[PDB]
Amino acid sequence: CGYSDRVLQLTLGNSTITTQEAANSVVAYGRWPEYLRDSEANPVDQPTEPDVAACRFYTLDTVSWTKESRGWWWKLPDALRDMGLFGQNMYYHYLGRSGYTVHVQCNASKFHQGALGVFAVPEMCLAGDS
Amino acid sequence: TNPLVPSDTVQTRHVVQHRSRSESSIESFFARGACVTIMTVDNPASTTNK
Numbered sequence: 001c002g003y004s005d006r007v008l009q010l011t012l013g014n015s016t017i018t019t020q021e022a023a024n025s026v027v028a029y030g031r032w033p034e035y036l037r038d039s040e041a042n043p044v045d046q047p048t049e050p051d052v053a054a055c056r057f058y059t060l061d062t063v064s065w066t067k068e069s070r071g072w073w074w075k076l077p078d079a080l081r082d083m084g085l086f087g088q089n090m091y092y093h094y095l096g097r098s099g100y101t102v103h104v105q106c107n108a109s110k111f112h113q114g115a116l117g118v119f120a121v122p123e124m125c126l127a128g129d130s
Numbered sequence: 131t132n133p134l135v136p137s138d139t140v141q142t143r144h145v146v147q148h149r150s151r152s153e154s155s156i157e158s159f160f161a162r163g164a165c166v167t168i169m170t171v172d173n174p175a176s177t178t179n180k
Contacts, residue, residue: 045142
């Protein structure tokens with residue numbers, strides 16, 4: 001019937017991503033995102049859950065890969081702090097939890113070469129300049 | 131004293147509580163050896179007048 005590892009469609013809220021050249025997709029540590037369970041709950045107040053207004057695809061500024069490029073990094077939720085109603089909900093509440101679908105995009109041509117390592121690191125503490 | 135809990139004045143979610151008051155029981159509060167005095171004694175030379 002035609003279906004494939006390489007051809008995917010993702011839809012969240014008012015946003016859809018298509019790809020004709022994927023290498024399957026990864027679910028970190030085998031765990032899909034979930035809301036906080038009552039047995040593991042800690043703040044007692046009724047939570048705010050924005051659903052489609054915040055759980056949707058925000059596209060960040062495009063960077064450029066060149067022969068000089070040593071590498072790029074981002075932190076979550078920080079990269080999304082100014083993104084629509086997600087950022088607003090984040091800055092109005094003391095506490096927040098969130099999972100993410102990260103989709104990195106980089107096409108080229110059958111005559112280009114190169115390989116990007118895309119790593120999702122829990123608690124990615126970086127070293128300082130001093 | 132007014133016996134209120136959070137759900138009486140705010141909208142609350144369901145939380146399954148696991149905390150306990152075990153360490154604040156009267157036994158637990160006092161279950162420790164406390165210093166109540168320091169006694170001084172000696173054993174001098176046979177000669178010393180004191």
